[PDB]
Amino acid sequence: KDAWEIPRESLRLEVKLGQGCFGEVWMGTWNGTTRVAIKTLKPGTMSPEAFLQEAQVMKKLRHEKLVQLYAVVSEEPIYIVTEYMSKGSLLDFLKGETGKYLRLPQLVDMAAQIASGMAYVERMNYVHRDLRAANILVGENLVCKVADFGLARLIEFPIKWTAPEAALYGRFTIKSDVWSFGILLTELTTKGRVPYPGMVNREVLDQVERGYRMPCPPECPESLHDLMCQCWRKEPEERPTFEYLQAFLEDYFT
Numbered sequence: 001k002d003a004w005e006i007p008r009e010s011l012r013l014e015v016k017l018g019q020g021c022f023g024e025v026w027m028g029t030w031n032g033t034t035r036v037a038i039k040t041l042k043p044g045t046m047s048p049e050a051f052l053q054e055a056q057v058m059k060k061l062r063h064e065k066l067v068q069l070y071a072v073v074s075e076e077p078i079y080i081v082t083e084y085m086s087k088g089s090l091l092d093f094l095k096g097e098t099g100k101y102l103r104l105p106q107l108v109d110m111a112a113q114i115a116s117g118m119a120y121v122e123r124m125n126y127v128h129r130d131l132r133a134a135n136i137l138v139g140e141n142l143v144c145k146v147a148d149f150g151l152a153r154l155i156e157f158p159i160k161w162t163a164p165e166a167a168l169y170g171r172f173t174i175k176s177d178v179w180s181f182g183i184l185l186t187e188l189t190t191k192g193r194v195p196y197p198g199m200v201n202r203e204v205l206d207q208v209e210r211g212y213r214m215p216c217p218p219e220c221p222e223s224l225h226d227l228m229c230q231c232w233r234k235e236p237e238e239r240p241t242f243e244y245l246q247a248f249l250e251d252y253f254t
C-alpha cells in the first residue's frame with residue numbers, strides 16, 4: 001500500500017460514461033467536492049496486480065497533457081481515480097456533431113497537444129503502446145489528454161495502429177508510438193474514420209510490409225501527409241521524435 005490510497009467511502013460513483021472489457025468507467029465525486037472519473041476492475045477479466053500496473057505508471061507519469069491520477073483504492077473492486085474530461089474520447093467527439101464543424105487549425109492544435117504529452121513520455125523513457133484516437137480524452141476548451149497506460153512500459157494488439165516491427169517482432173520503442181501517432185493523424189484529419197478501410201488484420205500487415213501507406217486524406221494538406229509519412233517510415237530510426245513533431249505542429253500555421 002502507499003500514499004495514493006483513499007477511503008472507498010469518499011467516492012460517490014454516479015454516471016457510467018463507458019466501459020471496457022477490463023472493468024468500466026464512471027463519473028463521480030471525491031470527498032463530495034471533487035468531480036472525478038473512476039475506472040473499476042470487474043472481478044473477472046484480470047488479476048488486480050495487473051489493473052494496478054496502469055496506476056503505478058501514472059504515479060510516475062505526471063504531465064498536463066496526460067490524464068491526471070488523483071487516487072487509488074487497491075482493495076478489489078479496484079478503483080482508479082483521475083481527473084474528469086468533460087467531452088470523453090476524441091474518437092467519439094470527432095465522429096460526433098461537434099466534431100463535424102472542426103477546422104484544420106483546431107485539429108492540428110489538438111494534435112499538437114497529444115504530441116506534447118508524448119514528448120514527455122518520450123523524454124521519460126516510456127512507451128505507451130496503445131496510441132489511437134480512442135485513447136485521447138477531450139476536456140473543456142478542446143484540451144486533449146492522453147489516457148490508457150495499461151500497456152505503458154518503461155523501455156527496459158490494435159494492429160492497424162501498431163508499427164510493423166512492433167506488431168511482428170515485439171520491438172516496442174517510442175518510435176513504434178510515433179508510428180501509432182501518424183495513424184492517429186489520419187483519424188483527426190478524417191473526422192474519426194477507420195484506418196485502412198476495407199482491410200482486415202493480416203491484410204493490413206502484409207500491405208504495410210510491402211510498403212503500402214495510406215494516401216493523403218482528402219481535405220488533408222500534403223505537408224501534413226508528409227508528416228504522417230515520416231511517422232510511418234519503415235526504419236524506426238528514420239521516424240521523427242515527438243519533441244520535433246510537437247515543435248512542428250505548433251509552428252504549423254506560420
Ligand SMILES: CP(C)(=O)c1ccc(Nc2nc(C3CCCC3)nc3c2ncn3CCc2cccc(O)c2)cc1
Pocket residue numbers: 017018019025037038039067080081082083084085086087088089137147148149
Ligand atoms: C458521452 P459523454 C459525452 O457524456 C462523456 C463525457 C465525459 C467523459 N469523460 C470521460 N470518459 C472516459 C471514457 C469512458 C468511455 C468513453 C471515454 N474516460 C475518462 C473521462 N474523463 C476522465 N476519464 C479518464 C478515465 C480513466 C481512469 C483511469 C485510467 C484511465 O486510463 C482512464 C466521457 C463521456
